[model samples]
Target: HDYTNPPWNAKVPVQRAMQWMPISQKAGAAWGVDPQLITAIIAIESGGNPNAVSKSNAIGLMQLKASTSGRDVYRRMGWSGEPTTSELKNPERNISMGAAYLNILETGPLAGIEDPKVLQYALVVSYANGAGALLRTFSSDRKKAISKINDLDADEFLEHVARNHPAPQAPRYIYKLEQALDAM
Candidate 1:
């Protein structure tokens, strides 16, 4: 099940969590992603800001960058011609693409793991690093990371990823995402 959200109060912002929680919940259910995790990602990635764009050109709440794995997602969806970046800025489009990207990661860099939290972290790392690069970065030194994983608790594991992983962004993402989780 998904997490709770503040009601449609007169004072809530339009970009409030519940506005997109249902979409994330449905998409997460389809993709085997936890709804709360999906919401957590949205909170961390774009703070429910539909107009948000990453420095890398990721659009919308999920920060989906179509220039990379995104083209594949667009093509698979039977979309011909390029989808406008503004179109991707729509929360619905963004969350669905994010979920699909997570699904892809699950079968790739995130595969072979039973723990949901670990898998989720790996998924974010893969999302941050891009798919091929993620495998290449980890494949050669996976044993080192996993040995550390087996020894650490969640906080320690975030620190481990922050300190040791070859790619730089994953640690930052894990830290920020964890912080958002703590706040909620």
Candidate 2:
């Protein structure tokens, strides 16, 4: 059973996505992950765009999938195959699936790395590449993720190197998120 707007189980403050943030925070706690971390994930995934869609058919705030591993996330919430009236586009369901899925990732491939920065890197990469070791590197050296910015830690340095680093087929998604995090 689901509500079109389910009552959130927590009273966490929702600073952005006014319609979606409450659900995002609540779902973060309810699903056993850091609520602010959940907020950051949504910020990156959708920039608070509740109606956002992805190239992968991932819907709403978290860009969750109907395919991919998302079916398992929804099934854990006791629904299947677009089952909830509070659908994936609904932030309640969407953020729940989002955080729940994050929890799944942590317990799975992201379990070993204790370094939060590296773990965040892995999680962000896994969001695109799944929870496997990324084959793409920030440069030909193949040793940069957070490690790319070790020396000359200036705005110009990070910006210049990361931009020119040439991550595999496309640009470095890690570089992109690292820039976003640095800007924050």
Candidate 3:
């Protein structure tokens, strides 16, 4: 799949994204994360297509797993409906839920981490991997890892993570995101 071409092209996706920029910014601000970072995440996750679905059953623009334990976050926020498999593909609902979940992680169990960048890295790693593993494997090298996320060249950042965190899927996941970001 040439993710950089055709349906994955940035034009349509970016245009679609503009409508949700306010939601992105709001979510990021609530979690002390950058709106651009959220934008990059959405681009990478589903190319900004609200109806995108991954082979792994990941859904929506953020590619959130349906079985993931994020229901509490949505429930706490008073979101109605069962978040159907199809609804997970909705751009507005997906981004809103994804951002809300991130906010919960930022302020919840991971609150002790003082650095926003470190917190983001941990959150992403936990989201991609698992919270237990991330807590166990987190190290002082967090600064270096977090710095890698800020790379202007998104591909290079994915490569860096792939090289550094060889055991996890973050590299491949991030690589897809970088591809979408570059298309934009």
Highest lDDT, which number? 1
Of the candidates numbered 2 and 3, which has the greater TM-score value? 3
Deviation of model 1 at 168, angstroms: 3.7
lDDT of 3 by residue, 1-184 (tens): 3222333345555555656678788777776666765776676666667787788777877778766634645565786534677878766677777877676666664556645545555566656665544443434454443343443253443344555554456645544444445654
lDDT of 3 at 87: 78
lDDT of 2 at 162: 41
In candidate 1, stretches whose alpha carbon ends up further than 4 angstroms from where it belongs are 1-15, 75-82, 141-157
What's the residue-level lDDT of 5 in candidate 2? 26
lDDT (10s digit) by residue, model 2, range 41-155:
6665677777788775767777777676567776666867643323777777678877878888777645654456555655665665564334233333333433542332344
RMSD of each: 6.8, 10.5, 6.0
In model 1, state the lDDT of residue 44: 67
> Which is superior by TM-score, 1 or 2?
1
The estimated TM-scores of all candidates read: 0.75, 0.62, 0.63
Query: How displaced is residue 2 in candidate 2, in Å?
Result: 44
**Model 1 residue 95 lDDT?**
85
Over 1-184, each residue of candidate 1 has an lDDT whose tens digit, in order, gives 1111221122122236546988998988987777776777777677778898888787888788777657867665776555568888877877888887788777755456656676667777778776454444444565544444445556665665666567666677776556555544
